[PDB]
Structure formats: structure tokens, C-alpha cells
């Protein structure tokens, strides 16, 4: 997924300042809360009954790190998302059976969380960079569905 020099630099500069343990958990938190049907996949995480139950559920915060960590390999290999996420595309489709539509949703919630933490720093151009990265990860995880 094709980014300008200024964009690739912009993204990584903002990512470097990101709390990898905190942000992943707020993203998955906010997915499980705003798009309630997503709880189907994570019924094994115990109590997802309230916004607070969900945000303060250790299994969520935990899973958040795996997801956010996986976006980091994504940022490490933007010229090779299709490959970086391959075994993991297999996993989400072949064993979990996640509708790829939800990848786009998580990604967009991730964008809402970055804008929430980075305030005025999450400029329209910075968003447009991150929107390309997040659609890229979504595409890669969707590849081994067809």
C-alpha cells in the first residue's frame, strides 16, 4: 500500500510515541463496545456486559497488545503486508471465520483512538496516512479468504 515519503515518516514518528499496551486495549475495547456483535468471537474472555466490564477486562487489554503488536510488524513491512499477515489471514478466515468487514471497523476505531490520544497532532494529513495503513492491514488479513 503506497505512501509518500512525508507520510511514511509522519506515521512512524506518531507510532513511536504510542503506548503499545494501552492503545491496543482501547481499540479492541471500543470495537467490542461500539460494534457489540464482535463479542461473538471473544465469548471466552468472560464478562463483556458493560463498557467498563469490557475496558477493564484483563483478557481484552492482553488481546489488545497482540493486535497492536501485529500492526507493528505491519508498519515494519508496509511494502509486504500481504505476506507479513499471511499465516494470520489463514487464522482469521480458516479457523476463526471473521467477516473481513470487521477488520475495516477495528482499523477505523484504531484511527478514532489515535485521534483521541494525539488530539490536535492527529492532523487531516496524518489521518489520511493512517487510513491507508489501516485499509492495507485489513486487505492483507482478507487475502486468504477468496
Amino acid at each position: 500500500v503506497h505512501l509518500t515519503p512525508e507520510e511514511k515518516s509522519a506515521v512512524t514518528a506518531l507510532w513511536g510515541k504510542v503506548n503499545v499496551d494501552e492503545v491496543g486495549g482501547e481499540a479492541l475495547g471500543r470495537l467490542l463496545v461500539v460494534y457489540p456483535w464482535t463479542q461473538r468471537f471473544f465469548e471466552s474472555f468472560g464478562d463483556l456486559s458493560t463498557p467498563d466490564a469490557v475496558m477493564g477486562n484483563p483478557k481484552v487489554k492482553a488481546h489488545g497488545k497482540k493486535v497492536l503488536g501485529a500492526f507493528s510488524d505491519g508498519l515494519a513491512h508496509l511494502d509486504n503486508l500481504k505476506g507479513t499477515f499471511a499465516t494470520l489471514s489463514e487464522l482469521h478466515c480458516d479457523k476463526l471465520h471473521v467477516d473481513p468487514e470487521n477488520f475495516r471497523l477495528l482499523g477505523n476505531v484504531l484511527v478514532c483512538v489515535l485521534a483521541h490520544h494525539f488530539g490536535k497532532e492527529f492532523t487531516p494529513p496524518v489521518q489520511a496516512a493512517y487510513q491507508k495503513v489501516v485499509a492495507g492491514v485489513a486487505n492483507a488479513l482478507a487475502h486468504k479468504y477468496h
Partner: protein, 108 residues
């Protein structure tokens, strides 16, 4: 157990492919998902979530299996004790011999 039978040797760690949190075997899936505590030779290991386990007192459950750091691994016989909310402790036994760990048995 007829289900846990082998392991693989990784860099400063061992991998149990059959301890699969995505196993179509509802029993194994649920056990792996609910692992509360892992001990090697009495030493309490930590859930390192998704980091490397290379030369750590750390375990990780992922799509490849249960990953165990070989830090608290002595020469000869070793005893690994996996605890999970639902199930009774699983005791696994392995043998380090001049830097080669081979599977022995796994029981409830």
C-alpha cells in the same frame, strides 16, 4: 493424555504444537484458553502475552502452540505443571541431555 504426545526444540524454548488455543478439539481449545499458572521444576513462569520466550521464565499460547522458555530447565529430568480454571493440572515430563530436550510423558 493421548492428545499431548510430542514437542519441538526452538531457540532457548520448547513448543507443544498440541496445546492449541484454536484446536477444533473443544477440550484442548478451552484448556489452553484458561491456563492460569505454569511451573517448570517448581519455578513459576509468566504469561509474556506475545513476546519471544527465548531464555525466559515465560510461556506464550499462540497459533503454533504453547511456547516455554528453557531458563528454569536443568540437566536430565524436568517437570512442567500447567493449571487451567476448568481442568485438573496437566504434568508434562521432559529430558535435557547435552542441550537436546526430548518428550517423555503428559498426564492428569
Amino acid at each position: 493424555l493421548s492428545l499431548i504426545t510430542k514437542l519441538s526444540q526452538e531457540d532457548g524454548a520448547i513448543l507443544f504444537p498440541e496445546i492449541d488455543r484454536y484446536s477444533d478439539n473443544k477440550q484442548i481449545k478451552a484448556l489452553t484458553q484458561q491456563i492460569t499458572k505454569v511451573t517448570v521444576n517448581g519455578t513459576v513462569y509468566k504469561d509474556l502475552i506475545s513476546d519471544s520466550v527465548k531464555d525466559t521464565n515465560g510461556w506464550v499460547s499462540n497459533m503454533t502452540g504453547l511456547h516455554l522458555g528453557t531458563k528454569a530447565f536443568k540437566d536430565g529430568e524436568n517437570t512442567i505443571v500447567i493449571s487451567s480454571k476448568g481442568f485438573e493440572d496437566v504434568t508434562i515430563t521432559v529430558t535435557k541431555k547435552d542441550g537436546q530436550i526430548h518428550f517423555v510423558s503428559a498426564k492428569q
